[PDB]
Amino acid sequence: ENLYFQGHMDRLITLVVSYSIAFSIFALATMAVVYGKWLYYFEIDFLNIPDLADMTKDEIKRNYDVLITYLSPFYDGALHLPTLDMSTNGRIAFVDVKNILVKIQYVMYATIMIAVIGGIYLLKKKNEKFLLHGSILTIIFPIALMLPIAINFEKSFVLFHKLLFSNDYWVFDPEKDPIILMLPEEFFMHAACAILLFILGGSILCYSLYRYLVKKKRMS
Ligand SMILES: CCCCCCCC/C=C\CCCCCCCC(=O)OC[C@H](O)CO
Ligand SMILES: CCCCCCCC/C=C\CCCCCCCC(=O)OC[C@H](O)CO
Ligand SMILES: CCCCCCCC/C=C\CCCCCCCC(=O)OC[C@H](O)CO
Ligand SMILES: CCCCCCCC/C=C\CCCCCCCC(=O)OC[C@H](O)CO
Ligand SMILES: CCCCCCCC/C=C\CCCCCCCC(=O)OC[C@H](O)CO
Ligand SMILES: CCCCCCCC/C=C\CCCCCCCC(=O)OC[C@H](O)CO
Ligand SMILES: CCCCCCCC/C=C\CCCCCCCC(=O)OC[C@H](O)CO
């Protein structure tokens, strides 16, 4: 009567743990790309942002450095671009973007702890499937968040937008928020591609860890 209860828990724990790694890797990849400077630096020359924005390369890079420094959850000050103006609707939008990254990070630290605490409880029990269930669940998670796009393309992006932001009938107007000119749509598309690229690598390493383990367990 008891080992029927115990098996019902380790399958629940494997679920809670598997989902926790799926999200942990999603967050970790997101933060690697958002706070990463290699990709955007590459896009300055690739997308010819100096001529898009009528700004020098050094201009563009130091404004970007200040923005990424602002988006740290540990920078308590307001956003003060070195050479660019900014509407109050602009400042609001960047507080929205910053709020997500703090929300994501706080949940990430939560899933990281549950994933390894619950993960070692399972490994102490000679059980490895959370490393395999997780591995495939990390591939599935980031785009289950994209699933609404398949149902309706323009309308789904109206809820993604309003889930994030605090002003509905705003604008991208370069005369009032000229940092738009150095943040073209292609940059965000490539960045998201880097986010999943990182997630894909993440799924592999923890699938490798599943196979390295269970092959040394069956060896005995
Ligand atoms: C007690 C309340 C605590 C709050 C948490 C309750 C949430 C549990 C949800 C359903 C129970 C079913 C438990 C086992 C379900 C099977 C898990 C499963 O679907 O396995 C595939 C997945 O990828 C992972 O392995
Ligand atoms: C945890 C904090 C301390 C340690 C971290 C320091 C903070 C990182 C800031 C700048 C370096 C960014 C440069 C590295 C960016 C590499 C990853 C990236 O996102 O760009 C690669 C791109 O995907 C391929 O084209
Ligand atoms: C349980 C799920 C897996 C557990 C994993 C344990 C944590 C591993 C810590 C760092 C690995 C990668 C961290 C990538 C982001 C940290 C660096 C960062 O944010 O700075 C910007 C970055 O340097 C620009 O590339
Ligand atoms: C969506 C997946 C992309 C993956 C993440 C890559 C992007 C993260 C790097 C920088 C974000 C900074 C810009 C984020 C958007 C700022 C909002 C904006 O454009 O400002 C509005 C305007 O100023 C007032 O109307
Ligand atoms: C509910 C919160 C629980 C309390 C919190 C306890 C701390 C989390 C424990 C381990 C994380 C260690 C591995 C994390 C890898 C670091 C990657 C990272 O966090 O980079 C983001 C950074 O802010 C880029 O600017
Ligand atoms: C594919 C998986 C991707 C993972 C995603 C995780 C969520 C990241 C959350 C916030 C990052 C900042 C989001 C900022 C998005 C703004 C994109 C945009 O198009 O900004 C308008 C720009 O002005 C056009 O020219
Ligand atoms: C043992 C119990 C613990 C179980 C834990 C499960 C094992 C997860 C393994 C790998 C996940 C790592 C995924 C990391 C993906 C983020 C991509 C990244 O960090 O990029 C590098 C960064 O840019 C550099 O500067």
CA angle 167, 169, 173 (to 5 degrees): 95
- What's the maximum distance between 2 C-alpha atoms anywhere in the chain? 74
What distance in Å separates the CA atoms of residue 124 and residue 217, rounded to the nearest whole number? 12
Half-sphere exposure of 104 (CA within 13 A, CB side): 21
Q: Which domain holds residue 42?
A: 3-215
Our count of domains for the chain comes to: 1
Residue nearest to atom 14 of ligand 7 (CA): 202
CA angle 110, 113, 116 (to 5 degrees): 145
**Is the CB–ligand 2 distance for residue 33 below 6 Å?**
yes
Angle at 195 between CA 191 and CA 200, to 5 degrees: 140
Ligand 4 centroid–CA 127 distance in Å is 42
Residue with tokens 């998670």, as numbered in its chain: 141
Task: Tell whether 39 is covered by a domain.
Answer: yes
In a domain, 160, yes or no: yes
Sign, CA dihedral 69-73-79-84, equals positive
Residue 168 lies in a domain: yes
What is the rounded distance in angstroms from the CA atom of residue 208 to the CA atom of residue 111? 21
Experimental method: X-ray
Q: Point out the ligand nearest to the CA of residue 38.
A: 2
End-to-end CA distance of the chain: 30
Helix (H), strand (E), coil (C) string for the chain: CCHHHHHHHHHHHHHHHHHHHHHHHHHHHHHHHHCCCHHHHHHHHHCCHHHHHCCCHHHHHHHHHHHHHHCCCCCCCCCCCCCCCCCHHHHHHHHHHHHHHHHHHHHHHHHHHHHHHHHHHHHHCCCCHHHHHHHHHHHHHHHHCCCHHHHCHHHHHHHHHHHHCCCCCCCCCCCCCHHHHHCCHHHHHHHHHHHHHHHHHHHHHHHHHHHHHHHHHHHC
- The answer to the question of residue 220 being in a domain is no
Resolution to 1 decimal, in Å?
Answer: 2.4
Q: How far is the CA of 9 from the centre of ligand 1 (A)?
A: 9
- Domain assignment present for 13: yes
What tokens does 212 get?
């390295």
What is d(CA 21, CA 9) in angstroms, rounded to the nearest whole number?
18
CA-CA distances (angstroms) from residue 52 to 57, 178, 188?
A: 11, 11, 16
CA-proximal residue: ligand 1, atom 7 (nearest):
12
CA of 63: how far to CAs of 48, 53, 69, 173, 181, in Å? 16, 12, 10, 18, 12
Q: Rounded to an integer, what distance in angstroms lies between the CA atom of residue 72 and that of residue 218?
A: 45
